[PDB]
Amino acid sequence: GTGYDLSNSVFSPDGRNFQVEYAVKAVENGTTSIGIKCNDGVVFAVEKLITSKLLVPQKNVKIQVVDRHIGCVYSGLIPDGRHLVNRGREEAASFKKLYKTPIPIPAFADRLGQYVQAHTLYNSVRPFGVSTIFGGVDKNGAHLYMLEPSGSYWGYKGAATGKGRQSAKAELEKLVDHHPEGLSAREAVKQAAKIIYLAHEDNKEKDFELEISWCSLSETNGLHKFVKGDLLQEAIDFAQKEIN
Amino acid sequence: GYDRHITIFSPEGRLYQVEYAFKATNQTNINSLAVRGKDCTVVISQKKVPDKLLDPTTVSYIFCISRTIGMVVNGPIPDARNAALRAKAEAAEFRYKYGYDMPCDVLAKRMANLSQIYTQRAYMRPLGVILTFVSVDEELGPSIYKTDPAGYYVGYKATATGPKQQEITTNLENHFKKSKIDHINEESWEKVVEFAITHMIDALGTEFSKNDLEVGVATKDKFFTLSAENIEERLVAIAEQD
Amino acid sequence: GSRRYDSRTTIFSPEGRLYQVEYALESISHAGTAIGIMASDGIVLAAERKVTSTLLEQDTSTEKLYKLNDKIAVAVAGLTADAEILINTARIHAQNYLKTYNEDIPVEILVRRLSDIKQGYTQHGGLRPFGVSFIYAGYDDRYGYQLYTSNPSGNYTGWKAISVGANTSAAQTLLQMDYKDDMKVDDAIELALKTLSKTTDSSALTYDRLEFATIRKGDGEVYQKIFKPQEIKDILVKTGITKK
Amino acid sequence: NNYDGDTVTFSPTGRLFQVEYALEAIKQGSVTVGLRSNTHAVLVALKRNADELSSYQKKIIKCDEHMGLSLAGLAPDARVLSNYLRQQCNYSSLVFNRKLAVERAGHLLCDKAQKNTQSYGGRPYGVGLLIIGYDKSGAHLLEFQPSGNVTELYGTAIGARSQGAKTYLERTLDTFIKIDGNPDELIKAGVEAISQSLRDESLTVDNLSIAIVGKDTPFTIYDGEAVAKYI
Amino acid sequence: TTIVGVKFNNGVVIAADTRSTQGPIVADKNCAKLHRISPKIWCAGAGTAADTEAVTQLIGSNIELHSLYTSREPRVVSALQMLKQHLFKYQGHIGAYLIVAGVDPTGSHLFSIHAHGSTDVGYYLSLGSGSLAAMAVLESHWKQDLTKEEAIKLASDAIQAGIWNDLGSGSNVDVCVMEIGKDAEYLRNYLTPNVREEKQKSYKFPRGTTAVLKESIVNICD
Amino acid sequence: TDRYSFSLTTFSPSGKLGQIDYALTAVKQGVTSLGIKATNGVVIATEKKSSSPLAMSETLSKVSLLTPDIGAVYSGMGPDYRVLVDKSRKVAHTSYKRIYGEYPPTKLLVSEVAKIMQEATQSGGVRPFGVSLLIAGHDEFNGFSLYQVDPSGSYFPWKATAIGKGSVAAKTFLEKRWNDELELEDAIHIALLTLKESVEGEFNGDTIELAIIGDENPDLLGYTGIPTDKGPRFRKLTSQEINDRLEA
Amino acid sequence: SDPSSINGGIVVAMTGKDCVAIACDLRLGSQSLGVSNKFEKIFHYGHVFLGITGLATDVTTLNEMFRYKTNLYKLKEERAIEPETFTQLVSSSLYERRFGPYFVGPVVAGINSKSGKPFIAGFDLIGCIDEAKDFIVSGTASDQLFGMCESLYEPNLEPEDLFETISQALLNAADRDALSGWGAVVYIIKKDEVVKRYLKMRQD
Amino acid sequence: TSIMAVTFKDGVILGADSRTTTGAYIANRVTDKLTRVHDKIWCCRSGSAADTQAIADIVQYHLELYTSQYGTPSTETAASVFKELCYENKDNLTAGIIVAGYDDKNKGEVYTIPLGGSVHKLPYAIAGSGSTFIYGYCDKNFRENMSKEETVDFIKHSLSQAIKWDGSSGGVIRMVVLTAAGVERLIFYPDEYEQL
Ligand SMILES: CCCNC(=O)[C@@H]1NC(=O)[C@@H](CC(N)=O)NC(=O)[C@@H](NC(=O)C(=O)[C@@H](C)CC)Cc2ccc(O)c(c2)-c2cccc3c2NC(=O)[C@@]3(O)[C@H]1O
Ligand SMILES: CCCNC(=O)[C@@H]1NC(=O)[C@@H](CC(N)=O)NC(=O)[C@@H](NC(=O)C(=O)[C@@H](C)CC)Cc2ccc(O)c(c2)-c2cccc3c2NC(=O)[C@@]3(O)[C@H]1O
Ligand SMILES: [Mg+2]
Ligand SMILES: [Mg+2]
Ligand SMILES: [Mg+2]
């Protein structure tokens, strides 16, 4: 037959759910976002296309925080990502209120995953048009996760999604193969800047603004903080030099 | 017609959505088997981590449902984790209400009834998964019970699930036909794990490193999963055999 | 969403008819014929079973004639299960009227309640109507003996003699041919059995293919008599339709 | 085509056609511009009338003593969204004795518009909004699209023929961004900007609407004879 | 009311009196207070008699459904949990004070349930107005490793003490014995120590003593 | 959010209810089962067709006890039958046992199950049950009875009948072999014979499932001390008994 | 005053040799004021009789409700309900209103149509069943009826003797109660015959 | 009721009496007021037997689900579940609960939760009607990082005094030792702790 790709929860004869895959397409249209796990934390980086010079730089922040220790960035439909972050904040508040401790990173990952998966069970709702890289530091160390519109998610040494996901994954594979001991938080910030600059080649039409955040047990005391000022400029300089 | 989109009967009397969910169960290209020892139950599943960026410790399809019940899923990981969370909740509530641990077959029947509900109600889609529950029930002993998107469930002497399921099933059938017993006559669970890995190697015609497998062992009053080094020790013991 | 699978069971055709009501009437037109004839001293109901097997247990079998209370009974034509749903609701309504007023319910009130239920199913809710047609035979102290008919549309009418189900054209022609206003209940029994034997799609009118009932005077009291298989056989040999 | 029957349907490319049709409903609306310096934020809207016997529909809505917006597209949707924004400002003031930050107002409008694009039933909003405000961090201008995307800018324009005004703002950036402490000059810049989007029409006291907010100047709307001094 | 339960080496016995009272008036001289929750799980009740009967019947129905669903013999701990949570939900307004005994695949069990939802476990228990009498016997005579007949006699003597020394208890002694291997045996009126003596007269009146005004026959057919 | 509030079974212009017809098709493609009413009992029987020799057929029971005097067998979709058995066991309590203190008669439990299935053919956003049930029971005032319940929700009393793939040949055989003076063992033997034709593979006490509604067995009661409480009328035959009766 | 003593009245049932008997008073009053002499308290559904003492409005409501339920029972089961089954139905219907019950004291009597065994039973207001072999009492003179029955009754009484016994019990109990009396009816019940007699008693 | 929990060098020990009273009548004289909610997280219950048992059962359910989802919970988490239950239902509950746990990271902790639902982390905690009579005594004898034998002696003496003075306390003295070596149960009979 035909027309299986018209409803959200319908299986195709090959076993797939084509609506989720169209959401994946919507994600692939988005800008590049990456996450790098280091020996005591995580780093998140995102490219922000400068549509016009009328945009105020450093405003229009894309990286979001969950609780006080979780960082979340997403590629695709930004409002869908904001909705997912709102749900995640509710889940974290509920978990903390009941169990006192802040939500562990795997628990938060599964909360987001169950939410997104539930959004593939009915024809009355649309799947999420974002792929979400998130994570942070908990009692068992650092955790990085990536979550797909199907509700699928995994833990990663490094993760990347968006229009420049290919070159970003290549650079991340190189970093993983060359550093079995692990990167440091600051070195990982510099590498994230470099990988964003490199993956911008797939979106090289418009100029971009780099946005970096990190959660390091030693550099940020286990809290999520935006990389600003001198450290941001140093990472930008590192990337500029390394791409030239 | 739209009898192919929702769970209503086709003129042939079929539910095509159930069949396509069955098809989706194979999407992960992973095979698994489960066998019963003298006083234990072992599950083996293929572990395939293609991306080097992945954290291989988080790539698993075997779940600890409770202290006593373990479940391995053949299907996509979103529906797998859906079923896993639901089964954990059901087991906890069963314990809270009835004062004893939920048996393997009872949890299997509950999950199968929920799958049947998805099979008969139009707004709920089936889960594209096959759930293999294992334990050492305090009344039944080593137990294997498996559910499918059709709401069907049954117990097994042994079982297999996946793209190459038929070959593994035939292998185990031949072994049990030769042995004339319905279990693996071994007192240690390590030797039962070795049996399972050996017969899956035979049926699939491939060799495994310690990173190509997930192993789950259920003994009286505990279900657990083996580490990469425990799997490596089992592989070494297998290699030293004839 | 789910709108694409909605059959829209309560909508009008361009000619002003209800699709599902017409199709349910078409369904009923294949059900075993049921006949009611009202005499001056009683009422008779006669219904024909469909495709009876020899192993069918006719003693405890009831597919056509149901008691609503002690003064009202019904012959059904159509889906037995829908009929039983409506029969239970009608019995409950009769007992409600009895409890509220300490008087037995008049026939037309019950008939109109059931017909209004049907109408509700033909105007809102998006559900399919009941594929059932009813012949009500009843007695109350206001109109004496009464014979009513109701269909999936929720319309009900009164009759001296009426038929529902299969072959209603020929049966109604025969009834109009032989009915007299002054006839007694036994003559009505004869007329009903003769009409059934002439309209039956089977070879001959045997007792195992019949359900029969009479509401008679016997004292100032009305009696509902649902004929047992042997009694049906005896009345058949009495009318001369079958041989002893 | 076969994927534009509702908002809950992705296209094979990954598009939401109902949201794009709403954006189109915006692009057919009358032009309005926004621009801010470091001390003020100004809204200039070109109002559209039905005929010569009718009025020119309002396009600027006040949300709080420090925050307002201009609309382009479906006016009832703008009314709904501005009422929600009024309540949010009001909740902030009443519960926390706190003027609502323009950034959080933009986030709330984004999250409000998003949920209409993911669930069956309903529709995306058919209006675009330009939000000016003065808060604890200074002057702010936001552009809101019913896709949910909200962005802060130094200046922008939406509606029909808005690209001329937008490119003028892109050119005039270094000039108007530092018109601090002089409101009339910022309003002159806004009128000059909106003039680029005029085709076979000129600004009158009947079709011009201006709004301004900033330091020591509550959000105020100038209409009619008041704007005659800018024509 | 006097109800007791006593474990023995291979099972559990429960026992109760048969006196049911509306305040100070004996309403029923032969009341069955031993309720069957499942074929091998029984329970003795005290307090609001309707409440005891109702909760035991309800939990027994749900236990039967649960046993059909799980394909297993019911467990005493399950009936205990269900009764406990039901009685707790109603804040003690369901005036049922129960002694639940039974044999299941996990062994023999003896528990008590308070009307507010609290549960107690022990080798010998007594509840009701006569409990203080019955317990007095139990604490005097209980020992570990009681035989079946020993425990039966101990429970019977506790119920007898309650019968004699409590105004809320009396008449006969009902017993239910539940052994690990056998079926549960339910001895109704295991003792009958309060048979009424023969009355000094027969009060049969000569026919026609009562004055009648009118009589009529009433039809019961249909 | 359940937005399927409309009927998924509607009348076609010909008068058919398509989903009920298709459920009947699914039933016809199921494994044959049957029931025979004797003078002192009833017999229900079916074939246990296991998928793999590794599968334990004894765990899955096609013949289920509803009440101590009422059992049921089916033909069609297994899971529908299992959820129907659960619902019927609960409704026998909520709608009767808890009101009258006695178990329902066979007719009324059959009517309750039929109501469930009818509602499944008319409620919003559901498909009919893809099974046909044969329910055999005994009550004090109606004796032994055997009913068939179809996906539409209709039910019929049978002296003997069969459903499933081999329904036509089995029905003919039963018609040519049934009388009104058959003892329970006679009905058991005729049921075994009728099963022997519809079963292609092995035919023994492990491949067929057979139960009876006969006399009360007090040994299956679990307790003694109540003279009015007798054993259940329902009893499943063991593989040993079936094989012993297969010799003749 | 309290709801079970506003209207007053008594019902008493007894068993004999292949027979039962159920009697009640006729008074309906509002505390001191006697209102009606014709308020009978025994109804019958098929062959099962039910007396109801207590609050009069609840007596009437329960009669109507049990008529409703027994009619539906007859329609579904295609037979008349038996005394044991009706006893269970009364108990469950009473307990259904556990925390807001009818202020009644029902009494069931009859002969089982199958076994021919006489049967009587009594209930409190929340449905506890007392299935006495000898006699059942209910009403404002429940203590007097208890004494009269425990003194007079002997088993295996023939109907003509059971009538005298139950009548003496009812009358002498009502004459020591300010709220009972004002006439009385007695039903003698045999498996295939029921007679109903009105008693002559003092009218104060 | 007399209950206490004491932390020491190797872990934590809980102790309680075994007296359940209905009025002045001892309904049970072998009561186990030491209740397990997780492998090495236990609680001493005091107050309404029904309320404490219901709360403990609900907390055990919550901790079993927490274990199935995220692994072994901390003692602080179990105390937080108890606190949520007791505080959100303070109008209908009368339960004083001492939560005592051991993990390899925090080496044993004690949280007291009295009426109202507040929670307090303490080196040791006493509760129950008998606890009053031993306040002074405990404040004069407790030290940090006592030995297992020292802690058992401290708890035995404290509960002996509490049982001596409080009629609501009595029976045997039950103790539960939670250490890295695991869980040990101790019982002390009246013939032993009365001579102290
Ligand atoms: C297995 C346990 C056996 N228990 C008994 O036999 C004993 N009896 C009953 O429970 C039976 C007696 C029967 N046949 O009605 N019910 C009532 O008494 C009923 N009472 C009434 O009708 C009335 O109030 C009239 C005046 C209308 C207002 C129901 C009621 C209402 C309140 C209430 O607090 C109780 C019982 C109660 C609570 C605890 C303990 C006892 C109770 N009542 C006892 O007398 C008792 O002592 C019981 O032990
Ligand atoms: C581990 C703790 C052990 N506690 C005990 O042994 C002691 N006993 C109980 O808790 C058992 C006794 C039993 N099983 O019957 N339950 C009740 O008393 C129950 N209540 C009742 O029966 C009644 O209201 C009757 C009288 C209505 C006529 C439940 C209730 C309801 C409110 C309430 O405030 C409490 C207990 C309570 C709070 C604090 C302290 C005590 C309490 N009750 C004591 O008596 C107490 O002194 C306990 O210490
Ligand atoms: Mg279920
Ligand atoms: Mg008087
Ligand atoms: Mg007087």
Q: Following DSSP, what letter does each residue of A164-214 receive, concatenated?
A: THHHHHHHHHHHHHH-SS---HHHHHHHHHHHHHHHGGGGTTS-EEEEEEE
CA distance E60 to chain H (A): 22
CA distance E215 to chain G (A): 4
> How far is the C-alpha of A195 from the C-alpha of A213, rounded, in Å?
14
Please name the residue that has the structure tokens 């009607």: H129
Which residue minimizes the CA distance to atom 19 of ligand 1?
G124
> How far is the C-alpha of H39 from the C-alpha of H127, rounded, in Å?
23
Proximal ligand: closest to the CA of G182: 4
Strands (E) located in chain B: 32-36, 40-46, 62-64, 70-74, 130-137, 141-147, 153-156, 159-161, 213-219, 222-225
User: Which class in CATH covers the domain with range E1-222?
Assistant: alpha beta
* Nearest by Cα to B118 from H68, A19, C126, F4: F4
List chain C domain ranges. 1-242
Question: Between the CA of residue G53 and those of B59, G64, G104, what are the distances in Å?
Answer: 74, 15, 6
Residues, chain B: 242
> How far is the C-alpha of A147 from the C-alpha of A132, rounded, in Å?
5
Which residue minimizes the CA distance to atom 31 of ligand 1?
E48
Beta carbons within 8 Å of F219's beta carbon, 6+ residues apart: F231
Is H35 an annotated catalytic residue?
no
Extract the tokens encoding F232.
């259940």
Contact G196 E215 (CB under 8 A): yes
Residue type, F236: K
Extract the tokens encoding C40.
């001056």
E22 alpha carbon – ligand 1 mean position (Å) = 6
List chain G domain ranges. 1-204
Q: What are phi and psi of H71, to 5 degrees?
A: 95, -165
C-beta separation of F74 from F33 below 8 A: yes
Q: Which helix (H) or strand (E) holds E195?
A: none
> How far is the C-alpha of B155 from the C-alpha of B144, rounded, in Å?
6
> How far is the C-alpha of H123 from the C-alpha of D13, rounded, in Å?
63
E89 alpha carbon – ligand 1 mean position (Å) = 21
Q: What domains can be seen in chain B, in order of their start residue?
A: 1-241 (3.60.20.10)
Name the residue among B97, B99, B139 with its Cβ closest to that of E72: B139
Contact G92 F100 (CB under 8 A): yes
> How far is the C-alpha of D221 from the C-alpha of D229, rounded, in Å?
14
Burial class of residue H140, CB neighbours in 10 A (0-12, 13-18, 19+): exposed
> Kind of pairing, strands B141-147 and B153-156?
antiparallel
In CATH, what number does D1-231 get?
3.60.20.10
Which residue minimizes the CA distance to atom 10 of ligand 1?
E48
C-beta separation of C211 from C65 below 8 A: yes
Question: Between the CA of residue D231 and those of D157, D159, D206, what are the distances in Å?
Answer: 19, 21, 11
Nearest 5°: the CA angle A205, A21, B16 is 165
Ligand 2 first shell, C-beta below 6 A: E 114, 116, 118; H 1, 20-22, 27, 33, 45-50, 52, 94, 168
Instruction: Report the residue of G40, G92, G130, G140 to disrupt the E interface, i.e. the one with the largest count of E CBs within 10 Å.
Output: G130
C-beta separation of E135 from E142 below 8 A: no
The half-sphere exposure of G14 on its side-chain side, counting CA atoms within 13 A, is 33
> How far is the C-alpha of B128 from the C-alpha of B74, rounded, in Å?
9
Q: Residue H173, SS3?
A: strand
C-beta separation of C27 from F11 below 8 A: yes
Extract the tokens encoding C154.
């929720």
Beta carbons within 8 Å of B34's beta carbon, 6+ residues apart: B41, B42, B43, B44, B72, B132, B134, B144, B156, B158, B159, B160, B196
Contact G92 F98 (CB under 8 A): yes
List chain A domain ranges. 1-244
Please name the residue that has the structure tokens 């019947």: E57
C-beta separation of A201 from A45 below 8 A: no
Contact C55 F161 (CB under 8 A): yes
Burial class of residue E25, CB neighbours in 10 A (0-12, 13-18, 19+): exposed
Which residues on B lie below 8 Å from E105 (Cβ)? 138-139
Q: Please state, as a whole number, how many other Cβ atoms lie within 10 Å of the Cβ of residue C241.
A: 18
Please pick, among A2, A31, A120, A161, the residue that the annotation labels catalytic.
A31
CA distance D173 to chain F (A): 49
> How far is the C-alpha of F101 from the C-alpha of F89, rounded, in Å?
15
Residue of E nearest to B101 (CA): E78
Domains of chain H: total: 1
Extract the tokens encoding B196.
């399972």
Nearest 5°: the CA angle F199, F205, F210 is 80
C-beta separation of F32 from F174 below 8 A: no
Q: What is the DSSP letter of F15?
A: S
Residues, chain A: 244
Alpha helices by DSSP H, listed for H1-147, are: 49-70, 75-88, 131-141
Contact E186 F223 (CB under 8 A): yes
Contact H50 E122 (CB under 8 A): no
Extract the tokens encoding D120.
């069956």
C-beta separation of E109 from E77 below 8 A: yes
* Nearest by Cα to D166 from D74, D26, D53, D35: D35
List chain D gaps (C–N > 2.5 A) by preceding residue.
none
Extract the tokens encoding C177.
């041919």
Which residue minimizes the CA distance to atom 10 of ligand 2?
H48
Q: What determination technique applies here?
A: X-ray
Residues, chain C: 244
C-beta separation of H148 from H102 below 8 A: no
Question: Hey, CA dihedral for G154, G155, G161, G167, is it positive or negative?
Answer: positive
C-beta separation of F68 from F234 below 8 A: yes
If one residue of E21, E131, E174 were mutated to test the ligand 1 pocket, choosing by the most ligand atoms within 8 A of its CB, it would be E21
Atom of ligand 1 nearest to the CA of G126: 29
Extract the tokens encoding B118.
């998805």
Chain mean position to CA H48: 15
CA distance B180 to chain A (A): 39
Extract the tokens encoding A100.
């006192």
Q: Does domain G1-204 have CATH number 3.60.20.10?
A: yes
Residues in a beta bridge with F162: F34
> How far is the C-alpha of F234 from the C-alpha of F217, rounded, in Å?
9
C-beta separation of H93 from H51 below 8 A: yes
> How far is the C-alpha of H48 from the C-alpha of E119, rounded, in Å?
11
User: Which class in CATH covers the domain with range C1-242?
Assistant: alpha beta
> How far is the C-alpha of C119 from the C-alpha of B59, rounded, in Å?
58
> How far is the C-alpha of B2 from the C-alpha of B17, rounded, in Å?
11
H162 alpha carbon – ligand 2 mean position (Å) = 19
Contact E68 F89 (CB under 8 A): yes
Residues, chain F: 248
Beta carbons within 8 Å of B239's beta carbon, 6+ residues apart: none
C-beta separation of C52 from C78 below 8 A: no
Name the residue among H69, H76, H84 with its Cβ closest to that of A101: H76
| Domain of residue F102, residue span | 1-248
Q: What are phi and psi of G13, to 5 degrees?
A: -125, 150
Rg (CA), chain H: 16
> How far is the C-alpha of E175 from the C-alpha of E188, rounded, in Å?
6
Please name the residue that has the structure tokens 């490199």: A198
Residue type, D98: R
Nearest 5°: the CA angle C179, C184, C187 is 60
* Nearest by Cα to B32 from B62, B3, B58: B62
Beta carbons within 8 Å of A85's beta carbon, 6+ residues apart: A64, A66, A72, A74
Proximal ligand: closest to the CA of G25: 4
Catalytic residues of E: 1
Which residue minimizes the CA distance to atom 39 of ligand 1?
E47
> How far is the C-alpha of B207 from the C-alpha of A127, rounded, in Å?
39
> How far is the C-alpha of D107 from the C-alpha of B48, rounded, in Å?
41
> Kind of pairing, strands H182-188 and C65-67?
unpaired
If one residue of H20, H48, H57, H93 were mutated to test the ligand 2 pocket, choosing by the most ligand atoms within 8 A of its CB, it would be H48
Please name the residue that has the structure tokens 């009728």: F194
Which residue minimizes the CA distance to atom 6 of ligand 1?
E20
**Helices vs strands, H then E, count in chain A:** 6, 10
> How far is the C-alpha of E123 from the C-alpha of A83, rounded, in Å?
59
Phi-psi category of residue E110: left, alpha or beta, with phi > 0 → left and psi -120 to 50 → alpha: beta
SS (H, E, C) chain D: CCCCCCCCCCCCCCCCHHHHHHHHHHHCCCCEEEEECCCEEEEEEECCECCCCCCECCCEEEEECCEEEEEEECHHHHHHHHHHHHHHHHHHHHHHCCCCCHHHHHHHHHHHHHHCCCECCCCCCCEEEEEEEEECCEEEEEEECCCCCEEEECEEEECCCHHHHHHHHHHHHHHHCCCCCCHHHHHHHHHHHHHCCCCCCCCCCCCEEEEEEECCEEEEEEEHHHHHHHC
Atom of ligand 1 nearest to the CA of E128: 49
Please name the residue that has the structure tokens 């959200």: A8
F176 touches chain D (CB under 8 A): no
F1 touches chain A (CB under 8 A): yes
Extract the tokens encoding D35.
């621009």
Neighbours of ion ligand 3 (CB under 5 A): B 113
Residue type, C163: S
> Kind of pairing, strands E25-28 and E212-217?
unpaired
Q: Residue D181, SS3?
A: coil
B87 touches chain H (CB under 8 A): no
The experimental resolution of this structure, in angstroms, equals 2.9
Contact A56 D7 (CB under 8 A): no
* Nearest by Cα to B32 from B65, B67, B75, B68: B75
Domains of chain F: total: 1
**In the CATH scheme, what is the homologous superfamily, with its name and number, of domain A1-244?**
Aminohydrolase, N-terminal nucleophile (Ntn) domain (3.60.20.10)
